[PDB]
Design a protein around this ligand. Structure first.
Ligand SMILES: Nc1ncnc2c1ncn2[C@@H]1O[C@H](CSCC[C@H](N)C(=O)O)[C@@H](O)[C@H]1O
Ligand SMILES: Nc1ncnc2c1ncn2[C@@H]1O[C@H](CSCC[C@H](N)C(=O)O)[C@@H](O)[C@H]1O
Lengths: 350, 353
């Protein structure tokens, strides 16, 4: 490219950056929701529907309109959210709602300055500086869990579903807020599940939902995955997007191997990307992935003097690290439902 | 006709793009972009050592920069380069031309999203006090622009203004802020007398110290609320830079500028280049960015004060109308081709008494 072209590109980028933010706001406010449930309408009409300050809404619509998400009729002075677009930005779109992931732009922006300090000074930014994250992660993750865990993900392991039905001891490591555990515990009443996280927040949350639903077969424990006394205690262990952000990932992978009874199974769902940089160029979401890794997944590990592999550790490294942990039978799967993650299946001999 | 499959891709690209912004915003603040411009193809290690920064962070930054396509990468030799054509628009060496500066605003708007959202629900707005890093940055980049072209480009737009100031005329700058404007003019025009007005004492005191330090007798500063001025036929010349749309009571301020001017006096108000019609702004670069800073900042700061909240994109048609409401029956709107972000509204006051 030449110079004129870059500026256009880079200017457009700034406009896109702003657009992202606007979408996140539309999500959190239910504007995007409200508009999907509406015909063409005026700023005041849309504000009234959403139960919001028209003024704020008016400017929102402006940005959305220039960014070509919303459509405004110059003649009638009404705005409209094209349906083909509303099914990609609304809660009702289930897993398809892309407005969720835009929330991360602001969340990452919140620590730009603390991050820049680590470029100069080393160390990293701890989890406690990202209070909003648990909720976003739960939501981002929750989309794929409700959509696909029980009927798509668990069936990737032959006979696992049957096994659960029969009864088995199952553990979710780095469980977060216990969503997957809650779904599985209702789904398989004869199996007993335990979820583990080092957060009080997550354990509280997962711990709570179960209290509410009376799911006896769900139980929650706070532990650090790098140090555990579980030996041969689980037939099945899952870990959903928790490995790359660990401080001592190889150790957790050893700790998983020990806690599995022989013939047991590890299902690690982690981000899909190459461990080689060149291979990620022009792939959608890579720039977003590296950003988050730098501003979150990469730094939170480093803050504990950890490994800091980041979000983009990749397939190659991830697999050979399962090899190193003792998993001699390892296969990688993917699903249409989740474009982001690989689904690594790893077995322990009997 | 755009297809949903198609939108998804555009919006994912958008998602990628926001991250790319932040990376550049970081690269500039870190001094990384500046650093690479001065290097030959090098390794993540070499680049981090060259910049005096932590390699691991530099590496994550480099990766995104590579995927975003800004930075080029020879995987064969594990080296990166910043192409000269790109280095040009992201380096501090471009002074005012550095694009990288504006990227910093993604995080700055990021930092207030939660408070802004609350506003949708409860009204009011986010107070000016919560935006210190934002203010200091604007002022730093305007300041370069003033250094770059105020005397040789901006003032000459007002026909016969260089002479008026050369001979010596009574000048005021409203919303002077840091005061860079006042300094440059008072340097270039020893004959004229300048006054800087702002209501932030910090700024006022600051300027006064700067004035005295440089020994400029002609420069002066005062703390006033622009909306509460009682000045009457004090100034031959009044300059206002990008400080009207943010006001609580803009109409009043314009009415106060009319009143403070002498008959035969001139107002130069610099403000954002946009239409007041929404339709007109679609397809014009940066429209989205501006509507965003407005909702996210310029609009709310006013609303916080029960203000007008006209916003960053109040536009030309509304600005001109407002001037006339204020009393100016003679107004021309100038543009400079180089500057695409601002309109230079030149409003003249009638000579009779
Ligand atoms: N050292 C550690 N010990 C236990 N949990 C850890 C940990 N380091 C990170 N984690 C967990 O890693 C999780 C990342 S996100 C949570 C994953 C969850 N399956 C979901 O999709 O919501 C965090 O919730 C955190 O609790
Ligand atoms: N009501 C008011 N009275 C006086 N100054 C005001 C004001 N409202 C806003 N301002 C000024 O608006 C300024 C922000 S913009 C500053 C413009 C400056 N000449 C530049 O181009 O860098 C603040 O410094 C503040 O002093």
């Amino acid at each position: 490219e030449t110079t004129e072209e870059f500026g256009n590109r880079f200017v457009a980028a700034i406009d896109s950056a702003g657009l992202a933010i606007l979408v996140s706001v539309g999500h959190q406010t239910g504007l995007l929701d409200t508009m999907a449930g509406l015909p063409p309408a005026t700023s005041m009409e849309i504000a009234e529907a959403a139960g919001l300050e028209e003024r704020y809404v008016r400017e929102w619509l402006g940005g959305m309109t220039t960014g070509q998400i919303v459509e405004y009729d110059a003649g009638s002075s009404t705005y409209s959210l094209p349906a083909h677009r509303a099914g990609m930005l609304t809660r009702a779109a289930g897993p398809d709602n892309l407005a969720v992931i835009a929330q991360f732009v602001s969340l990452l922006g919140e620590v730009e300055q603390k991050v820049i300090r680590c470029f100069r000074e080393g160390g990293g930014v701890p989890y406690s500086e990202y209070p909003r994250f648990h909720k976003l992660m739960a939501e981002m993750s929750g989309m794929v869990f409700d959509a696909a865990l029980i009927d798509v993900v668990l069936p990737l392991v032959d006979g696992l579903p049957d096994r659960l039905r029969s009864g088995a001891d199952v553990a979710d490591f780095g469980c977060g807020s216990g969503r997957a555990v809650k779904l599985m515990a209702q789904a398989f009443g004869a199996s007993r599940f335990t979820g583990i996280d080092f957060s009080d927040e997550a354990v509280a949350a997962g711990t709570e939902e179960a209290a509410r639903l009376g799911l006896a077969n769900a139980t929650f424990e706070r532990h650090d995955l790098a140090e555990l006394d579980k030996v041969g205690a689980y037939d099945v262990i899952t870990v959903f997007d928790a490995i790359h952000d660990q401080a001592q990932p190889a150790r957790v992978l050893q700790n998983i191997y020990r806690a599995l009874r022989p013939g047991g199974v590890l299902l690690m769902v982690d981000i899909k990307a190459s461990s080689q940089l060149e291979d990620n160029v022009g792939v959608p979401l890579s720039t977003y992935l590296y950003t988050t890794s730098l501003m979150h997944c990469m730094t939170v590990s480093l803050a504990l003097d950890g490994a800091g592999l980041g979000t983009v550790w990749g397939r190659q490294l991830a697999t050979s690290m399962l090899a190193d942990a003792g998993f001699t039978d390892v296969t990688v799967a993917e699903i249409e439902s989740d474009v982001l993650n690989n689904y690594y299946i790893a077995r322990k001999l009997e």
